[PDB]
Design a protein around this motif. Structure first.
Motif, PDB file in Angstrom:
ATOM      1  N   UNK A  12       0.955  -1.198  -0.018  1.00 16.88           N
ATOM      2  CA  UNK A  12       0.063  -0.075   0.041  1.00 16.88           C
ATOM      3  C   UNK A  12       0.827   1.129   0.211  1.00 16.88           C
ATOM      4  N   UNK A  13       0.223   2.160  -0.736  1.00 17.04           N
ATOM      5  CA  UNK A  13       0.803   3.496  -0.579  1.00 17.04           C
ATOM      6  C   UNK A  13      -0.077   4.751  -0.718  1.00 17.04           C
ATOM      7  N   UNK A  14       0.440   5.808  -0.911  1.00 17.99           N
ATOM      8  CA  UNK A  14      -0.455   6.909  -1.157  1.00 17.99           C
ATOM      9  C   UNK A  14      -1.584   6.896  -2.228  1.00 17.99           C
TER      10      UNK A  14
ATOM     11  N   UNK B  43      -5.498   4.749  -1.843  1.00 20.42           N
ATOM     12  CA  UNK B  43      -6.861   5.430  -1.601  1.00 20.42           C
ATOM     13  C   UNK B  43      -7.462   5.599  -2.914  1.00 20.42           C
TER      14      UNK B  43
ATOM     15  N   UNK C 156      -2.008  12.790   0.223  1.00 17.01           N
ATOM     16  CA  UNK C 156      -2.098  12.576   1.520  1.00 17.01           C
ATOM     17  C   UNK C 156      -3.082  12.905   2.410  1.00 17.01           C
ATOM     18  N   UNK C 157      -3.809  12.188   2.706  1.00 12.27           N
ATOM     19  CA  UNK C 157      -5.110  12.001   3.695  1.00 12.27           C
ATOM     20  C   UNK C 157      -4.972  12.017   5.062  1.00 12.27           C
TER      21      UNK C 157
ATOM     22  N   UNK D 160      -2.150  10.298   7.219  1.00 12.30           N
ATOM     23  CA  UNK D 160      -0.886  10.135   6.659  1.00 12.30           C
ATOM     24  C   UNK D 160      -0.038  11.481   6.939  1.00 12.30           C
TER      25      UNK D 160
ATOM     26  N   UNK E 237       1.366   5.878   5.410  1.00  6.64           N
ATOM     27  CA  UNK E 237       1.908   6.376   3.912  1.00  6.64           C
ATOM     28  C   UNK E 237       2.478   7.805   4.284  1.00  6.64           C
ATOM     29  N   UNK E 238       3.666   8.248   3.690  1.00  6.66           N
ATOM     30  CA  UNK E 238       3.975   9.507   3.755  1.00  6.66           C
ATOM     31  C   UNK E 238       4.692  10.010   2.635  1.00  6.66           C
ATOM     32  N   UNK E 239       4.620  11.430   2.552  1.00  7.83           N
ATOM     33  CA  UNK E 239       4.966  12.304   1.051  1.00  7.83           C
ATOM     34  C   UNK E 239       6.013  13.067   1.774  1.00  7.83           C
TER      35      UNK E 239
ATOM     36  N   UNK F  61       7.208   8.233   0.126  1.00 14.21           N
ATOM     37  CA  UNK F  61       7.138   8.696  -1.252  1.00 14.21           C
ATOM     38  C   UNK F  61       7.806  10.014  -1.489  1.00 14.21           C
TER      39      UNK F  61
END
Ligand SMILES: *Cc1c(COP(=O)(O)O)cnc(C)c1O
Ligand SMILES: *Cc1c(COP(=O)(O)O)cnc(C)c1O
Ligand SMILES: [Mg+2]
Ligand SMILES: [Mg+2]
Lengths: 398, 398
Positions: free
Chosen positions: A1-3, A6, B125-126, B129, B175-177, B206
């Protein structure tokens, strides 16, 4: 899973729609555009009836000449903010054209209408202040609320009573911005601005009206629904766009407030973006100035809208409005399948309209939205009505 | 008091600045623009040295011809969203040009770079996150954070160590940006992308890199600082603009992620605004394609930057960088008065540069920011250096 995980739901939903055999409504390409009312889509000559080119300005010869002259004289872009190196001759011109169009001392142009709403809402109302808006307001208005630090107060859609009750419960002292739209774009109905503005004033709120869907064809000067409803001089701020009647891209806010243009000093979506290209502001200037007195176009637009609205209703389509109140005519269908079949049959037969389904519309609402153009001919409108009759039958609307 | 009373401070501050006798730096008008490097300001022929027209594309004859041809063939605007009626031939072209420029399968164009950052950050990014960004990131990046629902994690400016420590303290699963800029625009210095991206990857984030200030002149293909630093294939998303090297208006994000283009289905600043005018996307397409191989321009740009940077430093100006690392050369002055006097003397002598003072810059930082153009001649650069020497003396810098 990643960004992007969703988006799995949206990807699956899209594939389900395509599984029905329908053309992807979100990937239509206008391969050629012959005029405001004719394009080539999927290799087929098609009548356009789903654009916001209300006054047909995009092919006006004065507009086109102004754009070409600006490219030649000033180049393709400004490469800078309005607060630095990005204000050319034509930016000053376009802001003066808006002052003249609306009869205001103040005018601030943004790079999009979305950004004008984002910026003006988030900049005017701060911490401890209130933004009061219709439940079904445009996305950019909600996004302006989200971008700012104000208290957000939704009122029931189209409800003068709920506006009044909700406003009345707020503390008296803090400043307040009531945000209204003249035309409700989904169905093409009109807001009761006279009554809502009276309510706003009773509670001491400032008023911002969005007149994106009325420019050039409501009110004696074409200023919008507020002008048609006799509210000249009573509206604190009017927001609009260059992308509809004007026929380019850009946003604006106008006002007679003496401190208005100090908004330039604070407004992040105004400051932190490049100004519009010379050609864009030159075409906008020319178009806005012509819109001040485009009487033949206005008359044609309304004649066309009345013929389309009257013809579709007489056929037996359920419309979003009982009377022709704007240049949007919304056909309401029973379910998603009916809407898609209708849309596809129209497209295949040579007509493009917009389809709107959830979550664009509320659950249970499935629409074909027709938007009329000053440059549609009476012949085209009859051709369209014939197409609607043929599709409505093959599908079983009607 | 009303909604505009909050601007009283900014209005008073502006008046104080004007009381010094300086030209209002926020109201400069380019009355005529003769070329990428020459304008008429206040009736005076002036060398431009404060624009982001790095590659001089705004007067390129192919770019201009493409814009005029698009006006003629497709009109002044699209009057609709990319998700409805606003995708013409040239929108498809410009997204393919970006794919070719960056060697990616995905490309999404927005109506401004501001909106590309606003949209991509708030959409990727939600809730639950994380967006991790440099303390001194561009306003649009901060505005994207504010627009979204993610947890925001600032790290100390230009600090690989603080990026690593802050990332390391976050929970592993979400997840991370990590959002980085290749060029720090204030001073024109360069981010340590190789090291920061390694840190991001170590923590499973990411990476989104903004390459607005490097396009066409960093890396073998002109893709940006990340390409110059050997990171080809390692960057999840690259964001950019059409308003700098490209020479128009617009934004974009490119990626090789297989689900990337599903972002179109969710991204509010993509969906809820009109697409760009045909002429804008036609000029962008042409410009982007030429930028792929604009070797003469690239060489001139860097030659010019090195001459300006080297000359100003040798004169005794304090610059933001020890070596010429970008096409921005920042002159650091001791106080606001010195900066304004310098700026005014340069302007009066026939040179426009950008001045940056608080709160645009940090308290204590007062700048003249020079931005070089491929189309500056060696003669112009020497003329500029002469002007800087003359003003630096009359003011007493140097
Ligand atoms: C169309 C529209 C906008 C957005 O305008 P763009 O110029 O396309 O960004 C904002 N508000 C309303 C009510 C609109 O109809
Ligand atoms: C210039 C810039 C932007 C904004 O781009 P516009 O196209 O002018 O809206 C966004 N991010 C960075 C880093 C920029 O430099
Ligand atoms: Mg033609
Ligand atoms: Mg010329």
């Amino acid at each position: 899973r990643d960004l992007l995980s969703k988006f799995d739901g949206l990807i699956a939903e899209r594939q389900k729609l395509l599984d029905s055999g329908v053309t992807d409504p979100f990937a239509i390409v206008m391969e050629q555009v012959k005029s405001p009312t004719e394009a080539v889509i999927r290799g087929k000559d098609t009548i356009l009836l789903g654009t916001y080119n209300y006054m047909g300005m995009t092919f006006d010869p004065d507009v086109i000449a102004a754009g070409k002259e600006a490219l030649e004289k000033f180049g393709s872009g400004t490469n800078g903010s309005r607060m630095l190196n990005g204000t050319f001759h034509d930016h000053m011109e376009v802001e003066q054209a808006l002052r003249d169009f609306y009869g205001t001392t103040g005018a601030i142009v943004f790079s999009t209408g979305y950004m004008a709403n984002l910026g003006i809402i988030s900049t005017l109302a701060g911490k401890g202040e209130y933004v009061i808006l219709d439940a079904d307001s445009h996305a950019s208005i909600y996004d302006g609320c989200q971008q700012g630090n104000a208290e957000i107060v939704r009122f029931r859609h189209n409800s003068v009573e709920d506006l009044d009750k909700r406003l009345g419960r707020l503390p008296k002292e803090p400043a307040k911005l009531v945000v209204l739209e003249g035309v409700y774009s989904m169905l093409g109905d009109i807001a009761p601005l006279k009554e809502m503005v009276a309510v706003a004033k009773k509670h001491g709120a400032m008023v911002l009206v969005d007149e994106a869907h009325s420019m050039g064809f409501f009110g004696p000067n074409g200023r919008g629904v507020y002008e048609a409803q006799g509210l000249e001089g009573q509206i604190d701020f009017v927001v609009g766009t260059f992308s509809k009647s004007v026929g380019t891209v850009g946003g604006f806010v106008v006002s007679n407030h003496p401190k208005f243009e100090a908004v330039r000093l604070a407004c992040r979506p105004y400051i932190f973006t490049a100004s519009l290209p010379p050609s864009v502001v030159a075409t906008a200037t020319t178009s806005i100035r012509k819109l001040m007195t485009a009487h033949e176009k206005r008359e044609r637009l309304w004649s066309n809208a009345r013929a389309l609205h009257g013809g579709l209703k007489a056929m037996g389509f359920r419309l979003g409005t009982e009377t022709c109140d704007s240049a949007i005519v919304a056909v309401m269908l029973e379910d998603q399948e009916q809407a898609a079949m209708m849309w596809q049959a129209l497209l295949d037969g040579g007509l493009y309209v917009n389809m709107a389904r959830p979550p664009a519309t509320p659950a249970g609402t499935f629409l074909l939205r027709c938007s009329i153009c000053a440059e549609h001919t009476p012949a085209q409108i009859q051709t369209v009505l014939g197409m609607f009759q043929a599709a409505g039958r093959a599908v079983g609307v009607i």
